[PDB]
Amino acid sequence: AQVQLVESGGGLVQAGGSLKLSCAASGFTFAHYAMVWFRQAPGKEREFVAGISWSGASTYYASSVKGRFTISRDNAKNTVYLQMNSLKPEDTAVYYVAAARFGVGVDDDYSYWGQGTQVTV
Amino acid sequence: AQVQLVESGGGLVQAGGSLKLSCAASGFTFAHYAMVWFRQAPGKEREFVAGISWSGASTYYASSVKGRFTISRDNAKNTVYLQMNSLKPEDTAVYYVAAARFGVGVDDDYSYWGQGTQVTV
Amino acid sequence: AQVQLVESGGGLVQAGGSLKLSCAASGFTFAHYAMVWFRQAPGKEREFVAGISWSGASTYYASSVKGRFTISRDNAKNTVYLQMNSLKPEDTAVYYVAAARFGVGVDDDYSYWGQGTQVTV
Amino acid sequence: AQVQLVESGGGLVQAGGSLKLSCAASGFTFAHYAMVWFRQAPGKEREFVAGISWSGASTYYASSVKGRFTISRDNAKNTVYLQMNSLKPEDTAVYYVAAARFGVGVDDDYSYWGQGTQVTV
Amino acid sequence: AQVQLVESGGGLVQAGGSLKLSCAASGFTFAHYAMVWFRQAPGKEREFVAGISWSGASTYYASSVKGRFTISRDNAKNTVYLQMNSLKPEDTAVYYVAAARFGVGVDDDYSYWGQGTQVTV
Amino acid sequence: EFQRKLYKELVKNYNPLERPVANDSQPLTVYFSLSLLQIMDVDEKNQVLTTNIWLQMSWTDHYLQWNVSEYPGVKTVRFPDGQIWKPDILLYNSADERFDATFHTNVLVNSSGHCQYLPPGIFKSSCYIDVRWFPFDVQHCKLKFGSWSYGGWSLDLQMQEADISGYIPNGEWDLVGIPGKRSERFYECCKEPYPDVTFTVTMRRR
Amino acid sequence: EFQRKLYKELVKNYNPLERPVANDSQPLTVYFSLSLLQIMDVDEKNQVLTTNIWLQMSWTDHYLQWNVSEYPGVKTVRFPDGQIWKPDILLYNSADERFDATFHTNVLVNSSGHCQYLPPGIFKSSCYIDVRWFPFDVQHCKLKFGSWSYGGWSLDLQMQEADISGYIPNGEWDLVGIPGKRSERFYECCKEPYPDVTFTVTMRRR
Amino acid sequence: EFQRKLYKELVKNYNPLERPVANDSQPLTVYFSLSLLQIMDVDEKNQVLTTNIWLQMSWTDHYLQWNVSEYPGVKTVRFPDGQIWKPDILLYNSADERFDATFHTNVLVNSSGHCQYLPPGIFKSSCYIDVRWFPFDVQHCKLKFGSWSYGGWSLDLQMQEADISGYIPNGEWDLVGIPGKRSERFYECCKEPYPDVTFTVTMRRR
Amino acid sequence: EFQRKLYKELVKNYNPLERPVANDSQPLTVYFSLSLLQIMDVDEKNQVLTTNIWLQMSWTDHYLQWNVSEYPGVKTVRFPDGQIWKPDILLYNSADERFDATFHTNVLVNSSGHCQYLPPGIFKSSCYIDVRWFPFDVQHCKLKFGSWSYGGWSLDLQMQEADISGYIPNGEWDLVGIPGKRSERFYECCKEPYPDVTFTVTMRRR
Amino acid sequence: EFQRKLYKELVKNYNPLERPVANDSQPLTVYFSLSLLQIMDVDEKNQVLTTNIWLQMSWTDHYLQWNVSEYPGVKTVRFPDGQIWKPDILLYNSADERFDATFHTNVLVNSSGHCQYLPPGIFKSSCYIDVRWFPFDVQHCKLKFGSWSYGGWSLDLQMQEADISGYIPNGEWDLVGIPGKRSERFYECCKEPYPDVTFTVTMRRR
């Protein structure tokens, strides 16, 4: 056990603000996994929000986020970060992380899922 | 036939209480199976709540339950127990057990399902 | 063609009554198939209600039906029977039969489905 | 391209009437395919309505239609017909055709789907 | 990264108008992929709207669009076009593109999806 | 057509690892009989006998029954190797480097499940050639067939008389008979008797 | 392109285990003919004849038809072994330790389903070499081909004249003819006639 | 029936690559014993000994247990090759071009998981024939069996006395004994001891 | 990494049964050339020539192109047998019991789809050895390569000069040349010409 | 248990076709060394040398690492052939009809991905036997190992000294040494250097 991913940084902000969603990991070797951010709306399905490969430089964003959000990782502190800028009214949904064994960041076979978080605009 | 799993201990309790959900089993060798607790909300899908491997010490809890709930098993009485503490207004759904042949507790190919139970906060 | 399964015996009855749902079969060798009863609620999914193997004695009931309903078959008349006793206010849904080639009664690869029937309490 | 299936004959009729739903085909060899009629209700899923094998005589109907509807095909005009008689109030849904390579009429791997049509009782 | 498909040309128009939905592509070799247009209604599922093979001349349209809409591609500017004429009140949904490696335009294994667009009549 | 429906229906719930018997507490019955075609060679420096043979095994499946009035035209079905349960009958005393020289073919089934299996082969048995009466001898060679895994309480093997009807006479050795016998032996590994069928070829020198 | 659509479409509902016939109550028609290339060896101490042959069998599928006006450019498709029904034609009298020396190749189909199969092989037959006229002899060797499982009422084999046109003359033995003949025989196992094709090679000593 | 349920249940969560042990920090126990049947040949120009042998390996699975009172009638299950973990026991000193002449067969299991595996084979070992006493000699030949990958701390091989009970006497060489011995050796590749079992065949010239 | 993305992307829509050509109404171009390494043996009692050869064929796929600026680091990919289309080029006149002695290896591809395939083999051809000038002879042996199924209008084979650069001189026979020539022949089976490449080894006795 | 979790986790995203290197623009490092066991035969009429050998190839995967504190008890994993990337190392000069006589076995991995592979084999190389000093000769034979597809910039082969420690003395020929050498050669097919390892066996006549 102890394979736990904990998210933080949620809340509510008016249109055109900032956010620093973060996710800490424990229980597994953090340097052999590529975290991916997923977003689910109350009345929709899962959707990509960003992805980073295990090597360190493979960032793949989504079409509707390409210019606003930025993803990053820190192996020393076992954390991932998704800086959100210029939020817009339709970016309201639960954001959670999903790890995966050695991978590129693009579609893969995820192993360890994370917990939900609430962000409202 | 006679492969029956019967749950008990449900009911309603105010926030911050206690519960001792139990599940007895019959019809199959209880020492060759790893019980897993599943929870389903009225308007959601199945979700993990705990899991114990057949050996006896492989407890795997969920992220949003890591610190509150505790899972245990008794091979002499053919029973499983899920002690619930510090319940929150979100932990309202049907809880049922699912067995599986020799396994770890994490995702396997479940064989024998159980009956639903109602817990409200 | 002519592989037809016809249900009968539905209706409405107050809590704590009796019912003798029956299903006649035609078009296929009735002695090489194991009938299984399925129940679907208006706002739920399919669920087991009973099952009998082709041999004649393999009855497998469900956890919440174990003590009330009884399944039987008649090869001479090409019929199946599901006697229902002590009905509750939850046993309201469409009941239909499903055959399957030589099988045990438990999950198989069903071939010939049947028609729906309405039972209300 | 030009693999087009066009339906016709829809409309509204009181209970106990008649209908001559027809479907013309073009773009593919009509003599190497077995048309199947599917019906979908506004709040339900697809269901069989009839089927005819490529040879010409393999008509399989559904349990609830066995005695009323009649399926036929015409290879010279590249058409299929589903005569509907004694319509009842629950026979209201969209009817469309689906072809399939050499097949029996019962479940196959369909290739070319058709367009919807509205029939109300 | 940089595998981005951007749609444009959406809006609202009265019945019997015109539209020139366009989609630019970047990040991948545009000459080794066959774009396909998909349409999704608010309360329905995905559906074909058109498709063009990588070679240049394989246009496949849908049954209900066969005569109105016309698809085209431009390899020099890395763009796809879906001219819409004689729009009807039922043609209201989100239109988005989907690429696929060397293929015919008909059902394939899509790789790169696009962003949504809104067209109302 | 109906031949395409039959093949899709017969293999719905089939496990090729299961003894196809109706009551799993009773033994299946297999029928065994070989058919000679030619005595290709009889080595004497070594002790080996090479022959051309057709095995004949017949059992009665129970999961492959249909109705020829519902599937008109179709009266037989042929199943390749690896999709239908087949007895594992080997030659106990073999001198081939592979230990099994049978060439696997299809299993033929009819409207009642009576399966037939006739693998051809060029078998190299192990005999004992006696040359103390070199001018004239009546050599006897043995061929012992039996089931490897299944035996006793599971697969009651039965024997049928050999079929010397296509025999092509040899040059030096002439046949005199090929009697068969059935025996039931106990081995040290297990505690349940195993049956076997022994055919005795009698070759007289010319 | 269209060659990929054709291959994705032709195998939608195909069961390699079913006879590709339209009316399942009629027999398919296969055409058989061998082509000699060389008489590699003729052993005399034993009785064996080694040759280099190309088999030629042709049937007509009914599930592999398309329209070349709808699939422009594609006028032929080649299917490997194990994905299309192929006749099981064996050599009854073989002296090879494997009993089958054919080297499997592709099957070539055209716009009407007419299939062709020409496996090459180095076949080791079994002959009877007579040396009562050692200076001059006209030896006759037989090659018997036929279907193992399918026979009678199912697969009406037919014969076509052999093709000696690439023959490379041998050193000691010279060819005189290779006539063919079709026969129908009854076997003890079943009750339905089985056809067969026999080719008689005539080799005269030089 | 219940056999079809047993075969569907026993393979729910099974990984053929996993050692079937309960506590993964303890070694499994395998039991090894060979059974001679005949000394087919003893070459002297080269140095090779050809024999007919039946290997006997027995371990105890832990994932293949059921209750015969819940599955009445079924008291044994046979698993083919490639679906159940089997020890990789090879013959170190072999002179066969393939290096492994065993003919794989089924593995037999009973209600407690005690598996049995008895592959037959025609083994060509490598011996040293001494002819310094040509009229009379007592040659000793060795057969060394052991696990290739698993060894030490993982698979504690154990030996059981050979079984010369179906031996068919040879012509020139007569048996005098076949003792066995278990040894533990260190190799240069790894640092963990590997066990092995050596059987010494004693053949005296007649 | 990018090598794991490339292998997952290159096989999205690939049908190993499809000719990798852009316009399906045009013939692909294959390049053939053999490389000798040693004349292992030249039998005279029979007529057979055993040699060690490396085949060399090189076509140009059209479905296996990528951009090395988008997949940095990866400049070549190697595909095993059975996952990429490979020409079926055989030896028409072979004396091997299997008829094909090539040892299949990987196919090597670069950033433009130019595939390379160099299978090694120990080929046993069939020659005509003349001994009318026993003291001195200039024997000529022929090796004929060609496509079995694909031929004419589909696969325009082309020849490249042989490569005798690693040749290890033999003891009795010495090489004098290995010229090659391309021919186009009509066969009786079909009506479309088939190309072939013939190499002539000229071995002179020492 | 944990051994069942480890095997299910290690193969989540694994492509057996990908070079297991972290930076795909750097060459992997394989370590090669053979181990002799016996000089089985040295033919002189032909030119062939038959030996018993154990190859030893060692590399370092990067996708098969775990933590023994999280998976207690499990410290090594064995992967069969076909599920993990293995170098394709062949013998350039071979006289075997199959061209590859290695018997594939499991690949052994430990907690850091250091994979070991030791296939046994009976190798038939091709040597040059000189008899100009028949009473006494010091013959030298060569064994050349190398990678077929991977070479240069991809797989930097390295050599390790041979291991003659289980050698069983032969009768007529006695060993004098087995030195090794590493070379880098350019071939005509490609433009990138390929490495190879040559071992020279020195046998002196007794």
Ligand SMILES: *[C@@H]1O[C@H](CO)[C@@H](O[C@@H]2O[C@H](CO)[C@@H](O)[C@H](O)[C@H]2NC(C)=O)[C@H](O)[C@H]1NC(C)=O
């Ligand atoms: C199918 O084969 C069976 C077996 O041969 C036939 O049933 C009888 O089988 C016995 C042997 O157990 C024979 O002695 C009889 O002659 C068979 N009956 C016959 C030949 O009529 C069966 O008839 C065959 N066909 C069908 C449709 O069942």
Ligand SMILES: *[C@@H]1O[C@H](CO)[C@@H](O[C@@H]2O[C@H](CO)[C@@H](O)[C@H](O)[C@H]2NC(C)=O)[C@H](O)[C@H]1NC(C)=O
């Ligand atoms: C495809 O092959 C068939 C069979 O050869 C061709 O149809 C005819 O077949 C008969 C033999 O049954 C030949 O005698 C004829 O010469 C064939 N017709 C020809 C050659 O025109 C068929 O033509 C071939 N091609 C197509 C497109 O069908």
Ligand SMILES: *[C@@H]1O[C@H](CO)[C@@H](O[C@@H]2O[C@H](CO)[C@@H](O)[C@H](O)[C@H]2NC(C)=O)[C@H](O)[C@H]1NC(C)=O
């Ligand atoms: C199944 O096989 C096992 C093993 O043979 C039987 O259990 C005992 O095994 C030991 C050897 O470890 C034998 O000495 C005993 O004789 C076995 N007990 C017996 C034969 O009663 C076991 O009994 C077998 N059957 C079942 C149902 O477990």
Ligand SMILES: *[C@@H]1O[C@H](CO)[C@@H](O[C@@H]2O[C@H](CO)[C@@H](O)[C@H](O)[C@H]2NC(C)=O)[C@H](O)[C@H]1NC(C)=O
């Ligand atoms: C990949 O291989 C091809 C083929 O060798 C290279 O393209 C040219 O191919 C022709 C033969 O058709 C050679 O004569 C040229 O020398 C090749 N160009 C070179 C070597 O620059 C191609 O360059 C290779 N590499 C890439 C990245 O395409």
Ligand SMILES: *[C@@H]1O[C@H](CO)[C@@H](O[C@@H]2O[C@H](CO)[C@@H](O)[C@H](O)[C@H]2NC(C)=O)[C@H](O)[C@H]1NC(C)=O
């Ligand atoms: C697993 O194997 C590796 C490789 O042998 C061990 O790591 C070291 O490897 C080098 C060779 O590259 C040896 O010289 C060292 O002796 C090895 N370290 C040792 C033996 O402690 C590694 O230790 C092995 N085990 C683990 C848990 O990593």
Ligand SMILES: *[C@@H]1O[C@H](CO)[C@@H](O)[C@H](O)[C@H]1NC(C)=O
């Ligand atoms: C099977 O056979 C046993 C005894 O032979 C008998 O008791 C039983 O009723 C038969 N039928 C079954 C078990 O279904």
Ligand SMILES: *[C@@H]1O[C@H](CO)[C@@H](O)[C@H](O)[C@H]1NC(C)=O
């Ligand atoms: C086969 O079908 C026909 C007609 O459906 C029926 O009369 C007959 O009884 C069936 N066979 C058996 C054995 O019942």
Ligand SMILES: *[C@@H]1O[C@H](CO)[C@@H](O)[C@H](O)[C@H]1NC(C)=O
């Ligand atoms: C098939 O052939 C039979 C007789 O040969 C005939 O009665 C039938 O009409 C034909 N067509 C079928 C069965 O579809």
Ligand SMILES: *[C@@H]1O[C@H](CO)[C@@H](O)[C@H](O)[C@H]1NC(C)=O
């Ligand atoms: C093939 O297609 C063309 C054009 O679609 C059509 O005219 C022709 O009739 C088709 N072939 C046949 C046999 O009908």
Ligand SMILES: *[C@@H]1O[C@H](CO)[C@@H](O)[C@H](O)[C@H]1NC(C)=O
């Ligand atoms: C397994 O064995 C170890 C030591 O032998 C012991 O500590 C442990 O309790 C045993 N059971 C396990 C690990 O489940």
Ligand SMILES: *[C@@H]1O[C@H](CO)[C@@H](O)[C@H](O)[C@H]1NC(C)=O
């Ligand atoms: C097997 O089942 C019977 C009846 O269900 C039960 O009494 C018995 O205890 C079971 N076996 C074991 C080992 O518990």
Ligand SMILES: *[C@@H]1O[C@H](CO)[C@@H](O)[C@H](O)[C@H]1NC(C)=O
């Ligand atoms: C293919 O070639 C034909 C004629 O050679 C030509 O008409 C066509 O435009 C080319 N391209 C295709 C068919 O895509």
Ligand SMILES: *[C@@H]1O[C@H](CO)[C@@H](O)[C@H](O)[C@H]1NC(C)=O
């Ligand atoms: C490969 O990618 C680079 C950068 O994305 C681009 O400049 C180049 O044009 C691409 N290759 C080709 C052939 O277009």
Ligand SMILES: *[C@@H]1O[C@H](CO)[C@@H](O)[C@H](O)[C@H]1NC(C)=O
């Ligand atoms: C890989 O190596 C290259 C050069 O050797 C270096 O530039 C790069 O940073 C390394 N790491 C990568 C590419 O992830």
Ligand SMILES: *[C@@H]1O[C@H](CO)[C@@H](O)[C@H](O)[C@H]1NC(C)=O
């Ligand atoms: C392995 O796990 C233990 C405990 O979870 C941890 O202390 C250790 O650091 C891990 N290994 C490595 C290399 O970090």
Ligand SMILES: CN1CCC[C@H]1c1cccnc1
């Ligand atoms: C003695 N038996 C019969 C021949 C093989 C052997 C046997 C027994 C049990 C399981 N496998 C093989």
